[PDB]
């Protein structure tokens, strides 16, 4: 299937890339809020993780697509400037599709729909080819292994193939 539309992916230097661009790269979704204090403590560690492991690399190994939990265009671009990798624009239909798909929302639950858990901010969901959750990196979970669970990334077996 085609998870994203033609004009959805959005990276630094302000240009669009299609879905075949993610071929052969470890693909992960970053459900995060701009002003959230979890995200302030966690974003520098994702910045270094994205730094060293693919810069000291033979091929491109990691892409992270930020998918935003924010409240404003101006707050979206302010968090955008501190972050180089891929992302998804907030007010496309895509953010609220992968929100209910991956169970990542922010206690706004009953005023929208009557399901249960939320598993909200923050989270990184490394994913497979068909929109499947590949494995969970436990920042805030039952493990609650924040700021260190990035080492539990299994990058060889999770490819966007």
């Amino acid at each position: 299937l085609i998870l994203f539309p033609e004009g959805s992916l959005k990276n630094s230097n302000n240009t669009v890339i299609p879905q075949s661009h993610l071929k052969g790269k470890s693909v992960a979704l970053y459900f995060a809020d701009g002003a959230d204090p979890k995200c302030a403590s966690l974003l520098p560690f994702l910045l270094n993780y994205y730094r060293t492991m693919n810069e000291g690399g033979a091929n491109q190994k990691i892409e992270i697509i930020f998918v935003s939990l924010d409240r404003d265009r101006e707050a979206f671009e302010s968090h955008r400037a501190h972050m180089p990798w891929l992302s998804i624009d907030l007010e496309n239909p895509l953010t609220e599709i992968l929100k209910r798909h991956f169970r990542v929302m922010k206690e706004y639950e009953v005023p929208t729909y009557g399901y249960g858990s939320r598993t909200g901010v923050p989270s990184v969901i490394v994913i497979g080819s068909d929109g499947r959750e590949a494995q969970f990196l436990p920042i805030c979970s039952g493990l609650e292994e924040g700021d260190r669970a990035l080492l539990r990334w299994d990058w060889r077996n999770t490819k966007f193939a």
């Binding site: 204090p37 302030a40 974003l43 910045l47 501190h82």
Partner: peptide, 8 residues
Amino acid sequence: GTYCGDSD
């Protein structure tokens, strides 16, 4: 009490 500066 939060953080800013985006440095490891």
